[PDB]
Amino acid sequence: VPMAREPTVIHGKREVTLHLHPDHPTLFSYRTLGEDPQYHEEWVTAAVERTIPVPVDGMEYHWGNNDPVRLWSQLTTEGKPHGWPHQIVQYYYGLYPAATVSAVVGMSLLALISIFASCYMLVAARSKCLTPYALTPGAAVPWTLGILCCAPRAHA
């Protein structure tokens, strides 16, 4: 039984493009090595190029009668993982997308709630200290509190 010629392999980010050149029809069966197989079996009869995904768990492609070949995918990603929050965010986005976006969204939301709550507490303090002085007939508003808190500009 013949052995089909080994395909040229072009590496990509979490995918690999094969360039299959049968001389007579052959099977090409690829499966990922994870929880969900993501299998696909196909006869090839003319020279084609096929992109097959290679998740971090691993992929195995079986071309013709050669032994199956297993390729795995390294944690390649774009962005420097140690400089400025922008590059770390990019690093994680490349590695595990759609989860770090959740992470940054959650962190940013918590930061916003913290900022807003703190600022509201500050303005509440402003009120609780200045409203005793706006309901008096005589707008004293001693310049200590006048500077320390933005003073209402009482109008004699």
Binding site: H11, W72, T76, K128
Partner: protein
């Protein structure tokens, strides 16, 4: 000494089990599974083969009523036809004109190749995992066969290993299985006696030698064409050939977790699932006394390079101060890093280089060498190669430890933001307490 670890059930991963008996030099037992087999139990409900539609030569009787009794043979169809006038080469078969009767017989049996070519159906339950584990420690390096379940014990160089049941009871084979020569499929085959014609199971029998046989292949044999002797039979073609042509995608190319199914002792090999818990009872003769092992003092660890590749892409160096030249265990207490080397050589010069594989941007682990601990915080940069042909040599843990550059920024931002927030709470409390009186 009774000790208990869990090793990943991934073929080829070197698992470094660290054994720390106080009063003895720590021993690193490196074990890796060279191959694992998961054989399900079988039941052999029935088999299905190419069938032979045997029809005998008809009895076209010369003007006498003949009627055949239905004998218990598989899918027997026996029928009598009136008014046949067979004609053979020389001439008419029987002189008497219209009263000739044809008796046509038809039955189906297993093919003459049924013993060789047959897809056999089973039901599968449980699964007995049977592995080969290569153990290595001191000067002992041996591969042993272990039934991975809490029963089988294997003695290797005086140490006794029990490899416990898998953490996950997952099996690749569903309840109902069919097996052809090399490949296996999982499909709800019809029970015995309920095979529809044409589809898989049109011809069924218990064993490859059993004489019972059940078949509904629809032998609605018909009336002979006038003036010629033959037995016309129509019948749906063999269901085995149909099942051959539209099997579906076999389990050999569907199996999750990337295990290969072999056939004869039907089994699923190298399935990367779960953890094997191992309990080891080791004798005192396999350990090394403290008094005859180097004593390491003031061990401080710095990482030379850190590339979290699948291969052993990080290198760190240990600076120490020993007292005698000798070799001793080295092991990383956290699965954030896995060290390639198990026994390290210690010279009087305080420098030993080790290679470690990681997956975290900031792997922080405490490396232990010859009974002393040091901490190693690194900072890895990602690899640029995308596809490599070897499996991962690191447990896939990614969460960087605190004081890593990444989460240290989060710590600083959170600390400052929260500090201003608690300052806000402080000022609110101050103003409200001042106002309260």
């Amino acid at each position: 000494y009774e000790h208990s670890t869990v090793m990943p059930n991934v073929v080829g991963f070197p698992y470094k089990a660290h054994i720390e008996r106080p009063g003895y030099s720590p021993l690193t037992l490196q074990m890796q599974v060279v191959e694992t087999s998961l054989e399900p139990t079988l039941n052999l409900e029935y088999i299905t083969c190419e069938y032979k539609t045997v029809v005998p030569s008809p009895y076209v009787k010369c003007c006498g009523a003949s009627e055949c009794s239905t004998k218990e043979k598989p899918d027997y169809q026996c029928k009598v036809y009136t008014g046949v006038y067979p004609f053979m080469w020389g001439g008419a078969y029987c002189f008497c004109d219209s009263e000739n009767t044809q008796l046509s017989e038809a039955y189906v049996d297993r093919s003459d190749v049924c013993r060789h070519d047959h897809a056999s159906a089973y039901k599968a339950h449980t699964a007995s995992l049977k592995a080969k584990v290569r153990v290595m420690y001191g000067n002992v390096n041996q591969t042993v066969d272990v039934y991975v379940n809490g029963d089988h014990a294997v003695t290797i160089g005086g140490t006794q290993f029990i490899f416990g049941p898998l953490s996950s009871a997952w099996t690749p084979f569903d309840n109902k299985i069919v097996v052809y020569k090399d490949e296996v499929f999982n499909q709800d085959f019809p029970p015995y006696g309920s095979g529809q014609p044409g589809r898989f199971g049109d011809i069924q029998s218990r064993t490859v030698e059993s004489n019972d046989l059940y078949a509904n292949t629809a032998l609605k044999l018909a009336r002979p064409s006038p003036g010629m002797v033959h037995v016309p039979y129509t019948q749906t073609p063999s269901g085995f050939k149909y099942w051959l042509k539209e099997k579906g995608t076999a389990l050999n190319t569907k199996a999750p977790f990337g295990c290969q199914i072999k056939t004869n002792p039907v089994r699923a090999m190298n399935c990367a699932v779960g953890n094997i818990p191992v309990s080891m009872n080791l004798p005192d003769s396999a350990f090394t006394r403290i008094v005859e092992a180097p004593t390491i003092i003031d061990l401080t660890c710095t990482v030379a390079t850190c590339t979290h590749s699948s291969d052993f892409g990080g290198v760190l160096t240990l600076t120490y101060k020993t007292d005698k030249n000798g070799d001793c265990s080295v092991h990383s207490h956290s699965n954030v890093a896995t060290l390639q080397e198990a026994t390290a050589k210690v010279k009087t010069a305080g420098k030993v280089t080790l290679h470690f594989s990681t997956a975290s941007a900031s792997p922080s682990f405490v490396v232990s060498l010859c009974s002393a601990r040091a901490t190693c915080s690194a900072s890895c940069e990602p690899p640029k190669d995308h596809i490599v042909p070897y499996a991962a040599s690191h447990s896939n843990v990614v969460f960087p430890d605190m004081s890593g550059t990444a989460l240290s920024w989060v710590q600083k931002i959170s600390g400052g933001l929260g500090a201003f927030a608690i300052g806000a709470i402080l000022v609110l409390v101050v103003v409200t307490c001042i106002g309260l009186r």
